[PDB]
């Protein structure tokens, strides 16, 4: 006989985006940016993601291959937080120069930090929605992938043109050689949930206020 599993309910989802973006496609049949030239994807065509913290479904590029994530449960104490107190939190960044590189580190809400603060080890998956508003004379060509070991290592990702597809969305699952890292420490050399944005070209006008 096992000690019983108890459930708590959260009721109506703080910081939920209930009016989404119109440039982000809901189904795969209404998305053909890979076909002509707008998105050059090395990780496939985007799959549909349903998440509670965003009102409408959206297609996302799988930066890593989706898996099952073994969760070892032999020590005392286990919890499934599981999209509770979960939100899409925005931040602004300027686009880097052609040589440099931009690493976006993941964030999470205050109420997720409290409840997860009752435990020692965790793992999670991550989602990203990138939006570049492109006014008129925009000729930016960007590149997004997931970092692996150090500063120069490049993996398979997506390249896209924000003038014709302004919003892109991504799916970053948990990939690590250890399940359940320590929350405040982590493994050295881990990927985590970071993504990497890199500028390929700048074919814009002189009138566009660059570093967009």
């Amino acid at each position: 006989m096992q000690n019983p599993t108890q459930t708590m309910h959260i009721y109506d989802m703080p910081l939920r985006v209930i009016a989404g973006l119109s440039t982000l496609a809901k189904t795969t049949e209404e998305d053909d940016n890979t076909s002509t030239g707008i998105v050059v994807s090395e990780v496939g065509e985007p799959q549909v993601v349903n998440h509670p913290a965003w009102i409408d479904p959206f297609v996302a590029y799988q930066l890593r291959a989706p898996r099952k994530n073994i969760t070892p449960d032999f020590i005392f104490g286990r919890a499934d937080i599981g999209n509770a107190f979960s939100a899409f939190l925005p931040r602004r960044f300027s686009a880097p120069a052609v040589g440099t590189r931009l690493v976006v580190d993941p964030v999470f809400t205050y109420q997720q930090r409290t409840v997860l603060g009752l435990y020692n080890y965790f793992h999670a998956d991550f989602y990203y929605i990138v939006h570049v508003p492109a006014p008129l004379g925009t000729g930016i060509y960007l590149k997004i992938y997931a970092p692996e070991f150090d500063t120069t290592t490049v993996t398979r990702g997506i390249r896209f043109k924000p003038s014709a597809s302004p919003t892109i969305a991504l799916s970053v699952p948990w990939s690590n050689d250890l399940s359940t890292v320590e929350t405040s420490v982590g493994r050295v050399g881990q990927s985590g949930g970071s993504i990497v944005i890199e500028t390929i070209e700048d074919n814009s006008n002189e009138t566009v206020n660059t570093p967009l």
Binding site: V154, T155, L178
Partner: protein
């Protein structure tokens, strides 16, 4: 590939000298449904990992660190096994054994004339338990006392440790003068999964050559095989091959020393993921020698205990007392890092004698 055969409950004594390592494989924590099999022709070259002379009646360590390994049968910078660690981030073992997930096999071979005769003890411990490796190196324990040890008698009149290839040409060498090419091709195309004899290596047996081989396990907590080289000094993953030549007398009934062997290896049991481009921090294959051994911080009291429960390590003038005075000296040093090396317990200085080495160590 590389299957998981179920043994009986009791091991038959005519084949095994130790009990079985387990009655089932130990495939928890390994994420087998994760990669993608990638069979390129470069994987079918073996790696000459060790070559040279090896002392008789002393366990010899071969640190089998496949990420940074050197090939002595090839002069280039990379080889068949280490280039697999250059190209990818994640290596995933296909199947497992009684120790851990297993990624390859080794093969010990030795071409000896008939006038010498001895035997070989060999075992390959995962490195999750390096204490059992290091206790055997220092002469504190023998290889016959841990599960998985095999005994092979190279002499000889014996056809045991020998390599016969019979070149992979499509002709099969069907016009050969005065004899048959045994097991090459145009005899049988025996599968890698099956384990059969061709039909011609059944009456030959000079070309059959009963091999001296084991497997290469890793460790039973990692999910995949991402190599960082800082984390594997704290929690080691790669195994260690332990070889011990026992008797080895000559025709003058004189005990030999320092026989020549050489060890081959392959890694044909892995899946790959996360192909990497223009990276800077690489697994840095060390030119022309080897890796060494890393003893992490949480393994000190396990090495310390095994000297203390050994009556021979206390009496002076023996080989075990030399290592034990070298072990107590390194613990009294200053370590900015969290691990020591087996080479630090070989190239160290000396004091007098045992007890005062321990009283100064309980204060540091």
């Amino acid at each position: 590939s590389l299957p998981e055969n179920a043994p009986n409950a009791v091991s038959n004594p005519q084949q095994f000298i130790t009990p079985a390592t387990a009655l089932s494989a130990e495939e928890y924590n390994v994420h087998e449904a994760l990669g993608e099999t990638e069979e390129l022709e470069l994987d079918e070259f073996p790696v000459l990992v060790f070559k040279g002379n090896v002392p008789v009646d002393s366990v010899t360590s071969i640190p089998l660190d496949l990420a940074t390994i050197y090939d002595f049968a090839w002069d280039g910078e990379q080889n068949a096994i280490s280039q697999k660690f250059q190209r990818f981030a994640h290596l995933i073992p296909k199947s497992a054994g009684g120790f851990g997930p297993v990624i390859g096999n080794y093969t010990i071979t030795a071409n000896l004339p008939t006038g010498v005769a001895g035997r070989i003890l060999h075992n390959c411990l995962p490195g999750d338990c390096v204490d059992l490796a290091v206790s055997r190196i220092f002469g504190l324990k023998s290889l016959l006392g841990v599960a998985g040890t095999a005994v092979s008698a190279i002499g000889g009149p014996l056809l045991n440790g020998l390599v016969n290839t019979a070149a992979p040409i499509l002709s099969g060498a069907a016009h050969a003068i005065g004899g048959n090419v045994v097991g090459g091709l145009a005899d049988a195309v025996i599968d890698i999964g099956s384990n059969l004899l061709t039909p011609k290596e059944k009456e030959q047996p000079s070309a059959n050559s009963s091999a001296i081989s084991g497997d290469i396990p890793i460790s039973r907590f990692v999910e995949m095989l991402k190599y960082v080289k800082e984390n594997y000094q704290d929690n080691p993953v790669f195994p260690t091959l332990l070889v011990e030549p026992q008797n080895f007398i000559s025709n003058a009934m004189t005990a030999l020393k320092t026989i020549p062997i050489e060890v081959f290896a392959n890694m044909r049991n892995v899946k790959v993921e996360r192909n990497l481009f223009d990276r800077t921090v690489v697994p840095t294959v060390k030119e022309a020698t080897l890796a060494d051994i890393v003893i992490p911080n949480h393994m000190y009291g396990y090495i310390l205990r095994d000297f203390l429960q050994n009556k021979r390590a206390f009496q002076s003038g023996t080989k075990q007392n030399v290592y034990f005075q070298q072990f107590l000296t390194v613990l009294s040093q200053r370590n900015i890092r969290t691990h020591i090396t087996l080479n630090d317990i070989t190239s160290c200085s000396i004091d007098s004698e045992s007890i005062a080495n321990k009283i100064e160590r309980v204060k540091h």
